[PDB]
Structure formats: structure tokens, C-alpha cells
Amino acid sequence: GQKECDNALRQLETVRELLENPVQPINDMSYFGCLDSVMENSKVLGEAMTGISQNAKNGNLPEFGDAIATASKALCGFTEAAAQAAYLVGVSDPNSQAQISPEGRAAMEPIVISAKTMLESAGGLIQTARALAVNPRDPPRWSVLAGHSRTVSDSIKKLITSMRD
Amino acid sequence: GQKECDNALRQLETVRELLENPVQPINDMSYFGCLDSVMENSKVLGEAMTGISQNAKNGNLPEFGDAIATASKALCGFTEAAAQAAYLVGVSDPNSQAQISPEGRAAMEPIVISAKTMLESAGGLIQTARALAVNPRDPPRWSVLAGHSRTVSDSIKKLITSMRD
């Protein structure tokens, strides 16, 4: 029973070193990966704290050690996300300055292409709608309008998909 | 009818200049502010495209111009979010390097304090639970365990709140 608590305290004072001065990337988690890790580890910690209290109350020491170890693992990943998220917050500040790596420019390109495609298609949609407003008796242009609306819909779906990961 | 379409095309080719080379902060939107702006402008654009097609079909030119202008405003804010989000993606890459501004270090501090408080409280919770596991007949320590669980719950709520804005 004491070993599970001793090891948990040793791991907790080690993972706090990330929180002391986080000015460098801790891991490869995005800002959404950090929050998702916080949400999942919070649910794991919530049931782990429940198991800690109940098994200490019921004298169920084996399951108590499992709850202690589960809580330790949850708290470590909880801080790895908070440490990386704290790094991303200060770096994403408008008054900061950053040199963008080639792998960074390769990651923002799927967002730039999808947005520039949307303006190109939405422009042609407005150009087509400008003529349909004067003369809607134009079956070919309604096909062109539908074609641009299809490229707009795809460019937006691919833009949101590029940001959620 | 033509003016609403001409002004929309002029605004669209102006806002695309943000997409050409986004290596600087465009606005004060966070990465969550960028995605939220994309989601809201997508709903506005969806109904605007509906109004563009229907009013061109029905010859309702005044409401057609309103739909064109609404679509133009939606597409501009749509790209202002994508341009800033593209900047944040490449800057948040682990292989990048960034000088963090004082206002940036002031924004990550609410995340760092809430996380370091959580480890401090969860450590005391495990320390208290270690004794309750041996002797649960300790009313004062159950109050101490409840006190640390209250500080853990508050530090986690304040940590998530610091990241969602």
C-alpha cells in the first residue's frame, strides 16, 4: 500500500519540472491535443479519486493501489498537456516573434491551399450568380454555379479537417 | 444587383492578400477563436448561398443583394480566421523557435499556476490517503482529504477555463 503512494509522489515531483519553465515544446501535441488530453485525464482522475476514497474506506488495499497508480498516471499526462498548452499560449501571442520551421510551413500549407481554393470558387460562384440574377433562364450557368458550390463545400470541409487534428 | 456582386468580388481579392504569406499575427484570435470563427461563418455562408440561389431563381433582387453581401462578409471573416490559424499552426510546430513576449508570459501564467496548484493538492491528497489506507478511523484526515480534493477540483476547473478562451 505504501509503495503505490511512494512511487506516485516520486513521479509527481518529477513531472512538475516541466511546469517550472516551459519555453520549449514538450511533445508533439497540438493545442487541441493538449485540451483533449486534459479532458480525458480529468475523467480518469475523477474515477481514480473515487477509487482512492472508497478502497481506503473499505480496506480494499489491492484496488486502492490500482486507484493510486491510475491517479498518478492521469496527473502526469494532465501536466504534460498543461505544460505544452502553456508553451503554445505564450508563443501564440501576437506580440511574440517566431521563426517558422520547414515542417511548420508544411503543416500550415493544407490550411492555406484550402482557403485560397475557397475564395477562388466562391468568387466564381458570385460571378456566375451575377449573371443568373439578370437572366436565370441559363441552364449551363446553374451547372457552373453548382460546380463552384461543390468546390466551396469541399474546400471548407478540408479546411476544418486540417485544423481539428 | 451588379453593385453587390462587384463590391463582393473587390473585397474577396483584397482579403486574399492575407493568405499569400501569413508569417505574422493577423488579429488577436486564439486557435479556438479561429476555429469558432470558421464554424460560425460557415453557418452564415450556408444560408447566404441558399439566399443567393433562391433569390436569383425567384427574381427577388433586393434580397439577392442582401445574400450576396452576407456571403461576402462571411467569406472575409472566414479567411481572417484561416490566415491566423495557418500562422498559429506553423508557429506551434515543435521544430520552430519563438521569442515569447511579456504579454505572452502573462497569458500562460494562469495555466502554469493552476497546474502547479493541482500537483501540490493532489500530492497532499495522496499523502493523506496513504495514512487513511492504513487507518481509516481518522476523521480529521478525511477532512484533509476532502480539502485537497476541493483544491484539486478548483484548480482543474480554472485550468480548463484558462485554455478555452
Binding site: 446553374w142 451547372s143 471548407i156 476544418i160 | 464554424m39 448561398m49 441558399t50 433562391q54
Partner: peptide, 24 residues
């Protein structure tokens, strides 16, 4: 809602609105 029937049988693609609703 995820599509709009235009004249002459063509469709206005609004599947990106379906993508937004499935997320939320």
C-alpha cells in the same frame, strides 16, 4: 438543408454544413 435544389435539376452543395453539425 445539406443541399438546395436549383433550377434545371442541379444541386447547391451544402454538405459542409453537415460536416459542422456532426462535429458539434
Amino acid at each position: 438543408p445539406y443541399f438546395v435544389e436549383t433550377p434545371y435539376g442541379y444541386q447547391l452543395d451544402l454538405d459542409f454544413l453537415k460536416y459542422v453539425d456532426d462535429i458539434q
